[PDB]
Every structure is written in structure tokens, then in C-alpha cells.
Amino acid sequence: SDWVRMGNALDNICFWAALVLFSVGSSLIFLGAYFNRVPDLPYAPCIQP
Amino acid sequence: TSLSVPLLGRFLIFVMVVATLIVMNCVIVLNVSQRTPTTHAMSPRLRHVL
Amino acid sequence: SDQESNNAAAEWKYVAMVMDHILLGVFMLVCIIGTLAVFAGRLIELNQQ
Numbered sequence A: 001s002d003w004v005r006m007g008n009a010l011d012n013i014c015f016w017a018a019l020v021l022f023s024v025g026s027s028l029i030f031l032g033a034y035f036n037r038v039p040d041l042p043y044a045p046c047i048q049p
Numbered sequence B: 001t002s003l004s005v006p007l008l009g010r011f012l013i014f015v016m017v018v019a020t021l022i023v024m025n026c027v028i029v030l031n032v033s034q035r036t037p038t039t040h041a042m043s044p045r046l047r048h049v050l
Numbered sequence C: 001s002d003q004e005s006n007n008a009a010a011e012w013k014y015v016a017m018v019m020d021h022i023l024l025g026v027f028m029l030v031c032i033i034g035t036l037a038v039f040a041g042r043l044i045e046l047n048q049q
């Protein structure tokens, strides 16, 4: 039972470690795309809206 | 091409690395959980830590 | 009688565990050694350009 509790505690802390890693890495990778918009060029749009 | 790595590939390799690390972690947690006194001795330092 | 049988079974389990530890070391070392033996020569040759 002691060994099982140790495994549970390791499982608990490593869940938060893994969640932070997954969320932060995915967010960074996709925020790289969120800031890759077409540059605001000094031109009119190709197709008049 | 190989001038850079696309975002899709980067994300897939990242999640594959994360899944590999989580597999290693699950193996470690299983190894710790299933220790029996007939094979392993009760390490008191790690017990105090955890 | 059950206790004696369980002790002998535990000896078998101990042998299996020792084999597993040795093989963990061997297989991780082989992973590293093969990863180097397949690529390192060419990568050194290209770095030495």
C-alpha cells in the first residue's frame, strides 16, 4: 500500500507537469501562426470589397 | 522542401515527443507502484520525499 | 506448503527482474550505439568539410 501511494503521488505531480508542457508547447506553436497574418502593405486590396 | 519545418510537422513531432515522455512516465509509475517486498526493499528517502 | 511454493515462485520472479535490468541497460546502450554507428561517420565527414 505504501508503494501504491508513492505511485499515486508521482502520478499526481507528473499530470500537472505534462499538462503544462502540452498546453504551453501547443499554444506557442499555434500562436506562431496567429501572428503570421498577411502584412499590412501600402496597397489597395486586389478585389474591391 | 527543407528550408524550414512546417507548423503541422512541428506540432506532430512535438506531440509525438510528449507522448513518448508520457509513455516513459507511465512505465516508471507502474514500476514504482508494483514493487513488492519480496523483490524490492523499502527505500525510505524516496518515501519521505513523496 | 503454499509458503514454500510462493518462495520458489518469488525466486523465479527475482531472476526475471534481474534479466530485465540487464536488458534495459543493454538495449538503451544499443539504441545509442546504433544511432551513432549509422550516422556519425557521415556527419563527422560533413562537419570536417
Ligand SMILES: CC(C)CCC[C@@H](C)[C@H]1CC[C@H]2[C@@H]3CC=C4C[C@@H](O)CC[C@]4(C)[C@H]3CC[C@]12C
Pocket: A025, A028, A029, A032, B004, B005, B010, B014
Ligand atoms: C514545440 C516547442 C516544444 C518548442 C518551440 C520552439 C520555438 C521557439 C521554435 C519552434 C519552431 C521554430 C521556427 C521554425 C522555423 C523558422 C523559419 C526560419 O526562417 C526562422 C525561424 C523560425 C520562424 C523558427 C523560430 C523558432 C521556432 C518558433
Ligand SMILES: CC(C)CCC[C@@H](C)[C@H]1CC[C@H]2[C@@H]3CC=C4C[C@@H](O)CC[C@]4(C)[C@H]3CC[C@]12C
Pocket: B003, B004, B005, B009, B010, B011, B013, B014, B017
Ligand atoms: C523534439 C521537440 C522538442 C521539438 C519538435 C519540433 C522540431 C521538429 C523543431 C524544434 C526546433 C526546430 C528548429 C528551430 C529553428 C530552425 C532554424 C531554421 O532556420 C530552420 C528550421 C529549424 C532548424 C527548426 C526545425 C524544426 C525544429 C527542430
